[PDB]
């Protein structure tokens, strides 16, 4: 009504309870069913739903669970499909709700058509920011934070990234042709490694139609880069190993897309196979279509380790293997959850470093370190608190869903204690603000 | 200009309807017929509605015989259950009459909106009484404060008599003089600012209203008052500066910052308002600045936010115990607003926040407390009252810290 808005400048909110909001979404579904006998009307009525939710998390979650129930009860009815449609639109508009994504939404196809999202501008900012890998080492560590933050966002909220796959395709199209020596001095191969890790995380939701087209473009860029360094391909053995791991997963989930991509561009692949005889894996791939047993003495020594010398030596050994083989740290997670609470300084610092490396490789397991991390924050040993505060922004960025309580605890120990966590807490706040809102 | 611009042609639709709807002897709807329809004790809102809905087709000249019957009866319209259609139509007729007989209409409409405490309730205000003191317009009935058409009438009369007083005092000053200029200007400025303050207090929700904000008569009244204050501030920004130096309830700040587009000029005197020795002027400056920053995120807005954080961190070490509590309880919720608007303030905001937190924790440790927040060092979130001030201020510091962190993570 204009009388309510008289005088507003119109340049950059109704309260309703639970059951009324449920009746409202049922009425929107009734509208959708009456019109279907398009997504335009259901998108048109969406701002009314948001104007009645007023951004309340409780209302959003209640609507979400009611829609999940409606999808389950209605099976795969037309109205059930419309329930999925407005549920995915609601997830787009309010992704702050960190509910894990049901498979019914993964099977939904309408997410990759024309739509509106709230966080797309932020993740777009993230990937263009990470792409500018200039020479300043402070900026290089900032780019590293960007890459691992995108890793965590990929594992946590995949679908928002999946609408940013042509984004990464374009980002990699730019830098492929440039020569090898300038490739290493301007530090662009790290960006390739980062986005490779991203895409390795993003599976198997990275394997639908529009995703398939963006992947095809990205893989054309990848093989163009590979053929661009046929005379200097022998330093990137681990990168090509990650590449063929991606290839194995690709043929595993979507075999026909990989077959179509390889057969359409069979001549560059056979050219790379012939030109570089050292590529055993490529030839084998084209023709065809560790564990506790090793770590056991080390975790034995770590568990039955009382002196600082034994802990130091076994932790240095685990450190060197993890530098070779970062995947091995998941086995030791429980042991050095306890060793990073230890009173010894260097041993605790090493346990912290290895734990952070562990959960940076695997952004899912960082939540398991939460109770021991804020135990370290709350510990009466001041050195433990100091080293936890040192590692606070990295872990908070690795946690996000618990970065609220983490930084609140950091502030409380800062103010009731005498330490000043303002630098660390402010850096963490800056980074996760760039994560969340702007 | 509003009383003049309404005369302007939109299409001439009303000319067509006057031509077509007025012929079938409808002029029999005499003013006394309307008065009989009004004075009937079952009211019969259908009859009065019919009469005035015929009256809209009359030109402004022939509506003049109907002026008294629809002004004098308008106090009856304040009663509950009177449909919005009659109030809007009476508003339209009053706006039409305002174009031909404005002075007589205003004088005889002020008298029609007295609270009716007495038998006549002093139905004797004249042009001169309202010109010496336009605030009589706001001494009207309690009930028009939530009657948006009648509120619009009152605002038109108030604006008119503010200007009329401005002229009248100049005329009388010239007559008597045959210094006083400063006294005249101060009187006009104080009178205008008092009008603004009374209007802002109308916008406040009374305790009866305490018992959905957007859809209420309160919100319509707030929009009307905001439009009027916008006109006043455009006309004389010194009035805006004076009103904010006086201050008003901080509860009105989101309303008056959102609804009045000319409040970005406040950013040009927030530094002067901060410099005032009064603590309450400083607190109001911080709160007003926080709301402006959340509205206008400009480079000068950030500069004044930096100045506010600096001044708030400066007087943290100037204030005593009681003054620290008094200053930092209202100004600490402004920090989440600064952090919303300006991410580059995070380092300064949290350094200031940790400083205030350490000061308040030290103060808590000095005396025995009922709550002892220090040993609550590891409590969890308290998402959302006789405690002592120091523990209250500690909890306030924590609360703004969770609001900041929640905002940054959402």
């Amino acid at each position: 009504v204009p009388r309510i808005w008289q005088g507003r400048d119109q340049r950059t909110v109704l309260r309703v309870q639970g059951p009324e909001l449920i009746s409202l979404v049922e009425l929107i579904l009734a509208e959708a069913e009456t019109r279907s006998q398009a997504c335009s009307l259901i998108q048109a009525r969406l701002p009314l739903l948001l104007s009645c939710c007023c951004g309340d998390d409780e209302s959003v979650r209640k609507v979400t669970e009611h829609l999940s129930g409606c999808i389950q009860q209605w099976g795969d009815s037309v109205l059930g499909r419309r329930c999925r449609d407005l549920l995915l639109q609601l997830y787009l508009q309010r992704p702050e709700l960190r509910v894990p994504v049901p498979e019914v939404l993964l099977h939904s196809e309408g997410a990759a058509s024309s739509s509106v999202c709230k966080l797309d501008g932020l993740i777009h900012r993230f990937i263009t920011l990470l792409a500018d890998t200039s020479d300043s080492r402070a900026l290089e560590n900032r780019g590293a934070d960007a890459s691992m933050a995108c890793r965590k966002l990929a594992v946590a909220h995949p679908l928002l990234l999946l609408r940013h796959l042509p984004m990464i395709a374009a980002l990699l199209h730019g830098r492929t042709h440039l020569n090898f020596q300038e490739f290493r001095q301007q530090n662009h191969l790290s960006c390739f490694l980062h986005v490779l890790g991203l895409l390795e995380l993003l599976q198997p939701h990275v394997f639908r139609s529009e995703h398939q087209g963006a992947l095809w473009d990205c893989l054309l860029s990848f093989i163009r880069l590979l053929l661009n360094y046929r005379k200097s391909s022998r330093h990137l053995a681990a990168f090509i190993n990650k590449f063929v791991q991606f290839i194995h997963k690709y043929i595993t989930y979507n075999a026909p897309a990989a077959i179509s991509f390889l057969q359409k561009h069979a001549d560059p692949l056979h050219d790379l196979s012939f030109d570089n005889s050292d590529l055993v894996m490529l030839k084998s791939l084209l023709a065809g279509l560790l564990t506790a047993a090793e770590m056991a003495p080390y975790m034995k020594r770590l568990s039955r380790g009382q002196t600082v010398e034994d802990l130091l030596e076994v932790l240095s050994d685990i450190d060197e293997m993890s530098r070779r083989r970062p995947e091995i740290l998941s086995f030791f997670s429980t042991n050095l959850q306890r060793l990073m609470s230890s009173a010894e300084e260097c041993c605790r610092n090493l346990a912290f470093s290895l734990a952070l490396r562990s959960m940076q490789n695997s952004p899912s397991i960082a939540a398991a370190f939460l109770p021991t991390f804020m135990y370290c924050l709350g510990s009466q040993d001041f050195e433990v608190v100091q080293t936890a505060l040192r590692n606070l922004p990295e872990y908070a960025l690795l946690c996000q869903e618990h970065a609220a309580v983490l930084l609140h605890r950091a502030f409380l120990v800062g103010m009731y204690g005498q330490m000043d966590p303002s630098a660390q807490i402010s850096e963490a706040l800056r980074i996760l603000h760039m994560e969340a809102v702007m | 200009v509003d009383d003049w611009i309404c005369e302007e042609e939109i299409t001439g639709t009303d000319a067509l309807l006057r031509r077509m709807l007025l012929t079938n002897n409808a002029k029999n709807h005499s003013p006394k017929q309307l008065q009989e329809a009004f004075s009937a004790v079952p009211v019969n809102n259908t009859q009065v509605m019919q009469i005035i809905e015929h009256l809209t087709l009359l030109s402004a000249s022939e509506l003049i015989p109907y002026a008294e019957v629809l002004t004098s009866n308008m106090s009856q319209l304040l009663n509950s259950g009177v449909p919005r259609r009659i109030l809007q139509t009476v508003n339209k007729l009053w706006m039409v009459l305002n174009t031909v007989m404005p002075r007589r209409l205003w004088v005889m409409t002020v008298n029609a909106l007295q609270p009716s405490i007495k038998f006549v309730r002093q139905q004797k205000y004249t042009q001169n009484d309202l010109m010496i003191d336009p605030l009589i317009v706001l001494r009207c009935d309690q009930r028009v404060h939530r009657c948006p058409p009648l509120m619009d009438i009152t605002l038109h009369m108030l604006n008119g008599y503010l200007l009329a007083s401005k002229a009248y005092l100049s005329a009388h000053l010239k007559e008597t003089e045959q210094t006083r200029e400063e006294l005249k200007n101060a009187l006009l400025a104080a009178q205008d600012s008092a009008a603004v303050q009374i209007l802002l207090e109308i916008c406040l929700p009374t305790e009866e209203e305490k018992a959905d904000n957007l859809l209420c008569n309160l919100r319509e009244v707030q929009c009307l008052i905001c439009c009027l204050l916008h006109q006043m501030y455009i006309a004389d920004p010194n009035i805006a500066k004076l009103v904010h130096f006086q201050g008003y309830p901080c509860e009105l700040l989101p309303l008056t910052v959102a609804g009045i587009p000319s409040m970005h000029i406040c950013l040009d005197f927030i530094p002067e308002l901060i410099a005032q020795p009064e603590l309450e002027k400083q607190i109001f400056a911080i709160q007003l600045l926080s709301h402006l920053c959340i509205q206008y995120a400009l480079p000068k807005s950030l500069s004044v936010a930096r100045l506010a954080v600096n001044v708030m961190g400066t007087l943290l070490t100037v204030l005593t115990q009681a003054k620290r509590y008094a200053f930092f309880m209202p100004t600490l919720p402004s920090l989440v607003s600064f952090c919303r608007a300006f991410p580059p303030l995070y380092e300064d905001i949290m350094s200031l926040l940790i400083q205030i937190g350490q000061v308040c924790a030290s103060d808590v440790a000095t005396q025995t407390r009922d709550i002892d927040p220090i040993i609550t060092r590891l409590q969890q979130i308290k998402e959302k009252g006789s405690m002592d001030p120091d523990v209250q201020l500690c909890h306030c510091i924590e609360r703004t810290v969770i609001e900041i962190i929640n905002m940054s993570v959402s």
Partner: peptide
């Protein structure tokens, strides 16, 4: 000026 928003398009004489 109170009559123009700070983000309004500036007038160049």
């Amino acid at each position: 000026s109170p009559s123009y928003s700070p983000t309004s398009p500036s007038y160049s004489p």
